[PDB]
Write a protein that binds this DNA or RNA. Sequence first.
DNA 1: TGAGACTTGCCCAGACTTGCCCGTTT
DNA 2: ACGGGCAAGTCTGGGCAAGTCTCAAA
Lengths: 234, 234, 234, 234
Amino acid sequence: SSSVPSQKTYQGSYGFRLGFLHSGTAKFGTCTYSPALNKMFVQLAKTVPVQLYVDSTPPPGTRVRAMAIYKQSQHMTEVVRRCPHHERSSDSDGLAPPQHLIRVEGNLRAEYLDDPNTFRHSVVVPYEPPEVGSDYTTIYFKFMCNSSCMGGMNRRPILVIITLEDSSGNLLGRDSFEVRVCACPGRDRRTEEENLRKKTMDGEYFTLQIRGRERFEQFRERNEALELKDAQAT
Amino acid sequence: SSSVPSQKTYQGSYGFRLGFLHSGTAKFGTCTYSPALNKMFVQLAKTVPVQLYVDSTPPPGTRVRAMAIYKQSQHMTEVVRRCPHHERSSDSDGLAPPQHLIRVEGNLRAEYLDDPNTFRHSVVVPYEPPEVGSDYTTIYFKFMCNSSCMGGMNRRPILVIITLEDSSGNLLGRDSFEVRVCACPGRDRRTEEENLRKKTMDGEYFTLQIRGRERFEQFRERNEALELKDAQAT
Amino acid sequence: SSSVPSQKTYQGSYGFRLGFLHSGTAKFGTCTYSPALNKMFVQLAKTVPVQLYVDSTPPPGTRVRAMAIYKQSQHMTEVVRRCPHHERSSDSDGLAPPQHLIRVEGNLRAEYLDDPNTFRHSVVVPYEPPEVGSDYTTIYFKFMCNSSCMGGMNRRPILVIITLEDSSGNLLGRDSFEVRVCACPGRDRRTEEENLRKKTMDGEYFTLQIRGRERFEQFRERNEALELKDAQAT
Amino acid sequence: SSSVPSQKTYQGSYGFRLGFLHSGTAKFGTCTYSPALNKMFVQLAKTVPVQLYVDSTPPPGTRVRAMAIYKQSQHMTEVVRRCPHHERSSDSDGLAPPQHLIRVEGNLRAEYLDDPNTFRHSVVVPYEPPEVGSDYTTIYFKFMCNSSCMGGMNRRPILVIITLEDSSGNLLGRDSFEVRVCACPGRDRRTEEENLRKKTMDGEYFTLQIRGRERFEQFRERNEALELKDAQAT
DNA sequence: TGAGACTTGCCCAGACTTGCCCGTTT
DNA sequence: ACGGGCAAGTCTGGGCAAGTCTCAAA
Ligand SMILES: [Zn+2]
Ligand SMILES: [Zn+2]
Ligand SMILES: [Zn+2]
Ligand SMILES: [Zn+2]
């Protein structure tokens, strides 16, 4: 039990936001991103490239923090950590504590915090400008546990919160995306995108006894507008 | 020995009311809320989130009171406790009295009051201002005792009054909503919303073709919301 | 967790065994017995007459003990007691401890034991000869909890072990019968006897490949034996 | 490779051997034994009864010890213990070390040993004679892990060894059986006997028709049991 | 190295269970 | 005093979930 950190998108004064467009080779050979679900599908310990976008350059000392929380409300108050099994392993490069789920790769300037009040785990790195020629900064993450790990996430969906903060920790920007660490990213992505499709492309009409004339016309109208936009695979 | 607290629709000075995240009606769905009923169906021990909305932020310290008492008048003056089976059953938290129905997990500034004289269990938390970007406040409850339990609510309906206090605990806000804790929120929600519509179905009601199952739930999530106003001022 | 007491029928040197043939009025107005299931169906706290049969008269000091254990193997090691709710009640005539499920009625010579090693509950009464004219002794029992009581038996089927022991406690005879304490004995009995019928009204066939002439002979003969018993009662 | 406990069946001077109960191939059947494979299919932490048969009463102070080892030769030298997850969890039982895989229910005289040399785990209990009227004594075990727990048995098959030792620890008897702790005993069993049933099937087989699914499976059991004795006895 | 073909843990909707009220029966 | 019609809790097995094995084709 611990207070739940906000997950509301907030572009802030710098128009902070994330992107997931990276070469499908040597970087995406494992993981795949679903725009429709805003969910990343990656294997255990495999690198996940995330792009940081910002309109103007942040003040000196700005950092980028990554944190994980459970998506479902009945679990939002439970800290996200590694399972007993994976926790005890040499997989730790020394820098990252064995109990942290999220790891930053390719950056020795990373810093892992184990909040003394919320007991929440997070990893932080100094904000760095985009490479000349590009308009985004790249950050490489690694997830050290399967979403299914018993004792750990235990088949519970998680959400990664990326926050842009000043030297003092004050919020400057915040974005997020769902994550499922599994053994078959490609497969699982199809299944989920397929289930999403059905929930959308459903052909079972229904009825409702609306009241009044105006309110009646509201739905009746806003409905003919949507029932028209259905023309997508036409 | 004492009396029962009121529950008049008291918005307040700013604009204090409660909101509930729309839940998809199922069978064993952990939790769901009925708009046209103002009733919250939910299994026990399963965290339930309740939204806090308000215009201008009240004066610092102004806490938010949450209490629950039997719906019907016949037992309205009876203390709401748990069954002897659940009494023994200890909880992860000791900061919350065992014979307590309502709870507030993920918080530390929450007070699980226990009024001896009036004999009315309750709980209060310091109204937290909406996070930078966040448009409202959230609080998590965990009703620790079913309604059908023998030796407790014993099938007897309940209710939960969320009132806004102040430095001492006077008046500044008021809200309410029925709370039936069971093992089938979805199943029970149909049998009730349906049995409701089986009452006075005549008048201005015209048929309206609605495609899509989910989209069908959407059109009702609003038609009923507006239909509430047709009762709000009754 | 406690060692499981034997439940194997043992007529012993006295041909000890039970019978359940009692007037359907003032004695069976509540409970009913199923020969096909060897299961008694009785309401909470209602008297249940059981007949003790014996070929020759037992030595001086013989007693009759009644004990309850769970029928299903996964529960056999758990002591059978009353639920928290019913446990706390004036229903106790003083003689019988509030935690005992089984009670002997109409006999102030009864004695309730709460085993110091197995923690098992039981009630004992001195063996008494049959009434002149009859060839059986009657004993009246009372069950203080529904089979469904949560915290108690919790919908788990139980089995009552009646043992005939000498003054020292040594086993002389043992018999048993299943018991379901419910609110509608008649109803429940029909349902269960009806389900039993279907299971035996099964008329699907299967072929078996037996290896070895003498084996087939033995297997065949056995199957015929059952084939006949199928005609014996149709 | 330094020390592996024998698994050679040895009836000994007292004709020691085990027996089990007849279970149905349910879906989530708590426990079920397969005479065809001499393997027990049981759910995590659910009671498993094992019948102890003896031709003659063993000397005073005789004990029974259960120990688990891996069945596959390449793992025989690896101690069988609980996995990191389940290990870090104190169950209602406090007599058994948290790392031991096998536990004994309802017996406060059980003693758990951690061998100082072999480092193997084992639980021991006093041998008790059969209760008057019975032909065997019975022990109730519990397996605190799934055959598939990662960091534990890791989908590796285990063999449970029951030895009958004298007051000095000398061998008096030994029998054994395979164990699979899983979520669906019935299912997993039906599958194994299946693949087994489609193997070695040559010779002259007499055919016999049986009516009713229950009857058939009883016959099929006994027959599959004899086909096991035939095999190993050349 | 990409995905069928397993292996193996769990969800979950349609029963099924079961205490209780109620009007009618003997 | 026995069924019928509810109120709720829980069981059940088909289906889905999700890691691992393996074999042929880049
Ligand atoms: Zn893990
Ligand atoms: Zn309760
Ligand atoms: Zn009870
Ligand atoms: Zn385990």
